[PDB]
Amino acid sequence: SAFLEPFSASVWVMMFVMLLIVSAIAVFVFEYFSFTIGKAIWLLWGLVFNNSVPVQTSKIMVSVWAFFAVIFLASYTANLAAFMIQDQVTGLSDKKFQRPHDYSPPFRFGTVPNGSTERNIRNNYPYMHQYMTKFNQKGVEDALVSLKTGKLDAFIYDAAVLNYKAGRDEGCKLVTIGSGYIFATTGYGIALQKGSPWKRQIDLALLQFVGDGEMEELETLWLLDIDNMAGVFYMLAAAMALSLITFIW
Amino acid sequence: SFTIGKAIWLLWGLVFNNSVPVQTTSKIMVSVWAFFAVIFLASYTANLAAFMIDQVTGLSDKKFQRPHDYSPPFRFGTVPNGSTERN
Amino acid sequence: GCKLVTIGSGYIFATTGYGIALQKGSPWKRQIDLALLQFVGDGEMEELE
Amino acid sequence: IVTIHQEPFVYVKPTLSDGTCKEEFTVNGDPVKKVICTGPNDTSPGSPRHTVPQCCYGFCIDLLIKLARTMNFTYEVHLVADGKFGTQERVNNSNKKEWNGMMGELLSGQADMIVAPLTINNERAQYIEFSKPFKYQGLTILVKKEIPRSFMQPFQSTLWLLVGLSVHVVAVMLYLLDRFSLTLSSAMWFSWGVLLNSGIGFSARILGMVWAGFAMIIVASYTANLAAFLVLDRPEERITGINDPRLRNPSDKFIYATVKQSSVDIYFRRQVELSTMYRHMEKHNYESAAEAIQAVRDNKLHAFIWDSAVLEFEASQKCDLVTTGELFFRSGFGIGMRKDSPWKQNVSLSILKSHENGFMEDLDKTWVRYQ
Amino acid sequence: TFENMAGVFMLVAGGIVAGIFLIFIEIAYKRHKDAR
Amino acid sequence: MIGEVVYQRAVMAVGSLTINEERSEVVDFSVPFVETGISVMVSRS
Ligand SMILES: *[C@@H]1O[C@H](CO)[C@@H](O[C@@H]2O[C@H](CO)[C@@H](O)[C@H](O)[C@H]2NC(C)=O)[C@H](O)[C@H]1NC(C)=O
Ligand SMILES: *[C@@H]1O[C@H](CO)[C@@H](O)[C@H](O)[C@H]1NC(C)=O
Numbered sequence: 001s002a003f004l005e006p007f008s009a010s011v012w013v014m015m016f017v018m019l020l021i022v023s024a025i026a027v028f029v030f031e032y033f034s035f036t037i038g039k040a041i042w043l044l045w046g047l048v049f050n051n052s053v054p055v056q057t058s059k060i061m062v063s064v065w066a067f068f069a070v071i072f073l074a075s076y077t078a079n080l081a082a083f084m085i086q087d088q089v090t091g092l093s094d095k096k097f098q099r100p101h102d103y104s105p106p107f108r109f110g111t112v113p114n115g116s117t118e119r120n121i122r123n124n125y126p127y128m129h130q131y132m133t134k135f136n137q138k139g140v141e142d143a144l145v146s147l148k149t150g151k152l153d154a155f156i157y158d159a160a161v162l163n164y165k166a167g168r169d170e171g172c173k174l175v176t177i178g179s180g181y182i183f184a185t186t187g188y189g190i191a192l193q194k195g196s197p198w199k200r201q202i203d204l205a206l207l208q209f210v211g212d213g214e215m216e217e218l219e220t221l222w223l224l225d226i227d228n229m230a231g232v233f234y235m236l237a238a239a240m241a242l243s244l245i246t247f248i249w
Numbered sequence: 250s251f252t253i254g255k256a257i258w259l260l261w262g263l264v265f266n267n268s269v270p271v272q273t274t275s276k277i278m279v280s281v282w283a284f285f286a287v288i289f290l291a292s293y294t295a296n297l298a299a300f301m302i303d304q305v306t307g308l309s310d311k312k313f314q315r316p317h318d319y320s321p322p323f324r325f326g327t328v329p330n331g332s333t334e335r336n
Numbered sequence: 337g338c339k340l341v342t343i344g345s346g347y348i349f350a351t352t353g354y355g356i357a358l359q360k361g362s363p364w365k366r367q368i369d370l371a372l373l374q375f376v377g378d379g380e381m382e383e384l385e
Numbered sequence: 386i387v388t389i390h391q392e393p394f395v396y397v398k399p400t401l402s403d404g405t406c407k408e409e410f411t412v413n414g415d416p417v418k419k420v421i422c423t424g425p426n427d428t429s430p431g432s433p434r435h436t437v438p439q440c441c442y443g444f445c446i447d448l449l450i451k452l453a454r455t456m457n458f459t460y461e462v463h464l465v466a467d468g469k470f471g472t473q474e475r476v477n478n479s480n481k482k483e484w485n486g487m488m489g490e491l492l493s494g495q496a497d498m499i500v501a502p503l504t505i506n507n508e509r510a511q512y513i514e515f516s517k518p519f520k521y522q523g524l525t526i527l528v529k530k531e532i533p534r535s536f537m538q539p540f541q542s543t544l545w546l547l548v549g550l551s552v553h554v555v556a557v558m559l560y561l562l563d564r565f566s567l568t569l570s571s572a573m574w575f576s577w578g579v580l581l582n583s584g585i586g587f588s589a590r591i592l593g594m595v596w597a598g599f600a601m602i603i604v605a606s607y608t609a610n611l612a613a614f615l616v617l618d619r620p621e622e623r624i625t626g627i628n629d630p631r632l633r634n635p636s637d638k639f640i641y642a643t644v645k646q647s648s649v650d651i652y653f654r655r656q657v658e659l660s661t662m663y664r665h666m667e668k669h670n671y672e673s674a675a676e677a678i679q680a681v682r683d684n685k686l687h688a689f690i691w692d693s694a695v696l697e698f699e700a701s702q703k704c705d706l707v708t709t710g711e712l713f714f715r716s717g718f719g720i721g722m723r724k725d726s727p728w729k730q731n732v733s734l735s736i737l738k739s740h741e742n743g744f745m746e747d748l749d750k751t752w753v754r755y756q
Numbered sequence: 757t758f759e760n761m762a763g764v765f766m767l768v769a770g771g772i773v774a775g776i777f778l779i780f781i782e783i784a785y786k787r788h789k790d791a792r
Numbered sequence: 793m794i795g796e797v798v799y800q801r802a803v804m805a806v807g808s809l810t811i812n813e814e815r816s817e818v819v820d821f822s823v824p825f826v827e828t829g830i831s832v833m834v835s836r837s
């Protein structure tokens with residue numbers, strides 16, 4: 001959104017009611033200590049800015065609220081300055097993969113044939129396999145160059161390889177879908193022979209490596225904002241509404 | 250109007266927004282100088298915010314040369330039975 | 337509290353080294369020197385540092 | 386004695402018209418000792434090399450004179466004709482490795498004890514017995530200093546049109562309200578006065594109030610954006626040490642290299658962990674450190690790697706280069722002697738005495754501590 | 757939105773509600789003294 | 793440690809000791825591996 005609650009004032013209720021109550025209190029105290037609406041509202045809305053050209057004992061005690069007004073202005077400025085310092089598919093569960101035809105641009109996915117991904121998608125998405133086979137890549141280089149150019153909307157491949165390519169991508173324009181949204185989380189392991197008298201040692205060696213920190217060590221060293229547009233529209237709408245309210249009298 | 254009775258006052262009053270005692274056509278275009286004033290003030294404030302984020306480093310210091318001469322006494326202190334005392 | 341600070345890094349009065357002391361005329365001087373040079377030239381010294 | 390031309394340590398400059406060292410005095414007023422050196426002035430191969438007797442002075446010559454006075458030397462200071470340190474290389478009949486440069490001259494008889502930025506290295510110590518280091522100065526990385534760093538709206542410059550339209554609509558609304566209850570430009574002058582404080586001035590009242598309230602919002606947002614732009618402010622970190630992510634992937638856009646087969650090249654060859662990046666510096670090396678730093682100044686080379694005692698001195702002398710990285714491969718200097726030299730113990734004792742006393746500190750103050 | 761702004765708002769509200777009450781009697785006393 | 797090394801009691805001293813004139817005369821030291829020296833550390837706009 002633009003100039004809405006996510007940008008600032010997420011609750012967007014307490015600040016509004018506070019403004020209303022302080023305006024009412026200021027009007028009431030000004031009336032108690034010339035006009036209920038002809039001067040009180042004018043002063044209340046004119047104290048927020050220093051360019052009060054038509055400004056005219058009672059005002060001395062009223063003016064103490066200008067300190068609160070300027071403190072609020074400074075706090076708002078500081079909050080705006082501080083709150084400007086700084087992946088839609090979210091897996092295959094969304095309708096984009098299930099119903100690619102619902103979107104006007106056709107979806108051109110990617111899977112390397114004769115791999116563990118095209119085999120995986122067969123046993124879970126039977127009809128989607130035919131759609132996947134329409135767009136296939138010779139290897140990973142073709143898929144990456146197509147993604148960079150735009151031939152493929154998305155790429156489906158092994159998580160580790162995609163993460164490595166994203167971490168070493170030129171321009172950082174390639175990224176996976178967050179983390180934890182793996183369609184089928186598995187491992188790599190090391191293949192052996194059935195009944196071979198070596199797995200009982202290989203598994204223990206791998207567990208020792210991952211328990212001694214060797215695995216982590218091996219992994220290391222190897223791999224004007226939009227609010228401005230909305231604010232002017234909002235103020236114009238408010239001004240038009242006020243003009244209509246005044247004219248309807 | 251006046252050469253210095255109004256021009257100087259306006260020039261020194263436009264530099265701050267809280268100009269209550271501020272008063273045909275030529276002055277209107279000269280009034281845009283407040284834009285430059287506020288822009289310069291904002292730039293200076295931003296630069297200040299950006300930039301706002303012992304001994305003489307050796308044995309030649311006069312404090313080491315004159316420990317008791319200065320008002321604050323010094324104790325120094327070394328670990329005996331080592332090389333610092335010989336040094 | 338990180339309340340203790342030295343005088344910079346390059347203001348050492350008598351910049352010397354620790355090294356390892358051997359007996360005078362020991363035959364291990366050459367081997368120790370070569371091993372220390374190898375450690376300094378390789379990443380073992382940086383890892384320990 | 387054999388020395389290599391390095392600016393912080395060996396100032397190699399031509400002599401006067403007569404052919405002797407020119408008389409110079411330091412800022413403190415003390416005389417500057419100078420020794421005549423007979424090294425070849427020409428550097429490019431193929432030139433008519435001449436062994437002209439230039440004048441050599443700097444940090445190392447003071448230590449050499451101290452050693453001469455403490456041990457009765459008769460030094461001649463014969464500068465190396467090769468003009469390179471040199472560790473290991475071959476040219477023809479590639480079956481054996483021979484030393485070239487100061488090390489080769491020292492090994493093949495000829496020269497003697499070396500007072501130079503020759504560092505302590507493993508293969509160098511295999512054939513040459515050094516002494517106690519007189520300056521450690523672990524080599525660092527030198528980079529070009531960053532040049533000093535939105536007058537209008539930084540982006541989405543439609544704000545001018547938006548505020549103009551707002552001024553026009555509030556002006557026409559004010560005119561209509563006044564008619565229902567001030568001709569051509571009084572309303573726009575009032576709006577400009579509201580935007581830029583100058584003290585120039587019920588439906589019209591509330592309209593003006595809300596317009597003036599919204600007027601300050603734009604300038605407040607502009608000031609907030611200008612203040613918050615301090616986050617990036619360009620000035621990205623150049624290298625920050627060898628063990629950084631950006632040096633793990635060599636790129637032809639960011640070119641850096643060492644000088645020759647010095648201690649830096651030997652260190653890179655020995656540490657075989659990033660050979661893909663280490664091979665990058667091989668193809669665009671420079672003949673000398675002076676040429677390398679001149680290229681860096683001319684923006685030819687983005688980064689340069691050499692001994693810290695040279696890089697920091699050059700950065701202090703010329704305020705356009707800044708070193709990056711704190712320390713790595715802390716290997717000291719040494720007096721490169723021959724294994725048959727009987728002065729090893731006394732040379733080491735003299736070096737230790739100089740370190741213990743203020744002689745080394747005085748030499749650093751008078752030769753490496755500048756503006 | 758959080759404790760800081762709510763607390764400062766409560767503090768300034770207490771300040772203004774005390775200030776109006778004190779300034780009323782202050783003005784009354786000033787007028788009485790000037791017009792005894 | 794130096795006294796133990798000198799009088800045949802030990803043939804090597806891996807402990808952390810500096811290098812000085814008197815130290816280097818009785819026994820011979822190898823190349824240093826850690827840079828040290830005289831410095832001052834003191835406790836604490
Ligand atoms: C190296 O230094 C030693 C000692 O400084 C020299 O040996 C002699 O030492 C005695 C005292 O221990 C002195 O009185 C002699 O004058 C020293 N000899 C000479 C010739 O000065 C040793 O000679 C020195 N070696 C060299 C090559 O200079
Ligand atoms: C995949 O295997 C089939 C086997 O029929 C083969 O025809 C095809 O060329 C293979 N594709 C790749 C990319 O290896």
Ligand SMILES: *[C@@H]1O[C@H](CO)[C@@H](O)[C@H](O)[C@H]1NC(C)=O
Pocket residue numbers: 329330
């Ligand atoms: C060692 O230190 C103690 C106290 O610091 C001192 O009494 C003793 O004399 C020292 N040893 C020698 C040999 O001086």
Ligand SMILES: *[C@@H]1O[C@H](CO)[C@@H](O)[C@H](O)[C@H]1NC(C)=O
Pocket residue numbers: 454456457
């Ligand atoms: C060596 O120099 C010393 C000066 O300390 C002098 O006393 C001695 O006579 C000299 N010896 C020779 C052989 O020149």
